[PDB]
Amino acid sequence: AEVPSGTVLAEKQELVRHIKDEPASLDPAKAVGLPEIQVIRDLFEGLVNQNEKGEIVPGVATQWKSNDNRIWTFTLRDNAKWADGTPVTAQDFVYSWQRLVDPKTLSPFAWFAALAGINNAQAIIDGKATPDQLGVTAVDAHTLKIQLDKPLPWFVNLTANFAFFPVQKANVESGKEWTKPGNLIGNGAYVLKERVVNEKLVVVPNTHYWDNAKTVLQKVTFLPINQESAATKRYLAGDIDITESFPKNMYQKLLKDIPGQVYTPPQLGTYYYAFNTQKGPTADQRVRLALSMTIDRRLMTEKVLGTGEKPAWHFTPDVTAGFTPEPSPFEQMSQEDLNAQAKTLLSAAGYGPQKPLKLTLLYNTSENHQKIAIAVASMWKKNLGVDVKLQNQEWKTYIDSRNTGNFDVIRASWVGDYNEPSTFLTLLTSTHSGNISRFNNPAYDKVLAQASTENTVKARNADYNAAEKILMEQAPIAPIYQYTNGRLIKPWLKGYPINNPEDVAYSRTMYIVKH
């Protein structure tokens, strides 16, 4: 933690953190949900960490280089240690990453290694190649060399992901009890000291942690409470110092009673509508633009949602690491002007009384998606003068329509796999598996290919902005709003990275001030 000079710290540096449910596996390679992942970030540490701004800072690795973005070399500190005092070395990572993709591990996140492009990852997952074929080598105890199957300038950002955290072979091979309190040996800032199933997990500092001198909190208690409203009340009662999420029906009262403790930071996700760029009226750029421009994003976030979400003027969330967007020309316009321009575009497209625009908005049966769809269809009727029918389909049918392109407009969403623009922008390249709108634009592909060649964040940002400009002009998709993850944080709790869009936090950065 970085405590600013003058700050008066409380005598008791203990924290109670609420988590949404009982943690499943504390094994990085078997973890599934956020509760265990949040605890894992305190018990283990990857090659690098991600600070509040999303910048990549040293973890076990103190340096990382790659000129071609394909072969990466990480230099590891010589004072990284497991909770039992033994050293963390390059071999620990070779062992752990091989284990991540090993078919025997059945990791729910083995796929992340393939997303990261580590050579032969999928082949190993599929049982076609032995784990030792993975593109990771321990040149020596402090040198880890990685071979990717494509150029990935942002590869290092992915190593901050829990799936790439190291585990200690001797500990793991002791058997199923290896993750129990007193048994789990991680390399993070903390160590699991005690645990009461379905009640609490208590961690204390791993004094062997390389940066332990900066660790302030001496005890952190994770309280799993899968009660949507009770967590908030226990927080108000003083039993919790920080919560995760709160019901919309409680939001207004919280803003009125404790406005200085309510946080609704934009997160790494975008709710959007995808148009069929290959068939129907939506194949015409003018039609897509008109529809995108007539969605009233402020009305959607302020009235329909009303829970803190921000309008999405770009596909990539504006708070994404290394992303400094050029403003969208639509953000500064009154809705009435957008409506007028949209009507002109639609008319130019050849639609009107003689040829009415007939489209259907598709979504999977859901109370949430129905609410948004009804609101958007109303906007199109009032702002663009078009009657867009609504169609809800069962999940299986919805997925089929989505993949096969059997739709005009369809609800969609993307939550970044890592905190860097490429996770969003690569989705629109012509051959990407996740290109729902079926956008096939050579100019766009060219810009994204360019980004994969830029080593600096500054240069890549120029490409990402160029990409967003194309998405704004061609409107293959219509971003609507950016997700949020509401939290309540006590006035005395400092150091929580509330602005990190991926909500990646480590207790080592926190501290309690006298209040």
UniProtKB/Swiss-Prot annotation:
It comes from the Bacteria. The keyword Lipid biosynthesis does not apply. Pfam families: SBP_bac_5. Changing residue 274 to E: Cannot bind murein tripeptide. PROSITE patterns: SBP_BACTERIAL_5. One of its GO terms (cellular component) is periplasmic space. One of its GO terms (biological process) is peptide transport. L-alanyl-gamma-D-glutamyl-meso-2,6-diaminopimelate binds at residues 20, 32, 34, 267, 402, 413, 415, 417, 484. The keyword Transport applies. It is found in: Periplasm. Keywords: Peptide transport, Periplasm, Protein transport, Signal, Transport. GO terms for molecular function: oligopeptide binding; peptide transmembrane transporter activity. Belongs to the bacterial solute-binding protein 5 family. Part of the ABC transporter complex MppA-OppBCDF involved in the uptake of the cell wall murein tripeptide L-alanyl-gamma-D-glutamyl-meso-diaminopimelate. Is involved in the recycling of cell wall peptides. Binds the cell wall peptide L-Ala-D-Gly-gamma-meso-diaminopimelic acid. Can also transport ordinary alpha-linked tripeptides such as Pro-Phe-Lys, but with much lower efficiency than OppA. Cannot bind typical tripeptides such as Lys-Glu-Lys, Lys-Lys-Lys or Ala-Ala-Ala. The complex is composed of two ATP-binding proteins (OppD and OppF), two transmembrane proteins (OppB and OppC) and a solute-binding protein (MppA). This is Periplasmic murein peptide-binding protein MppA. It comes from Escherichia coli (strain K12). The gene is mppA.
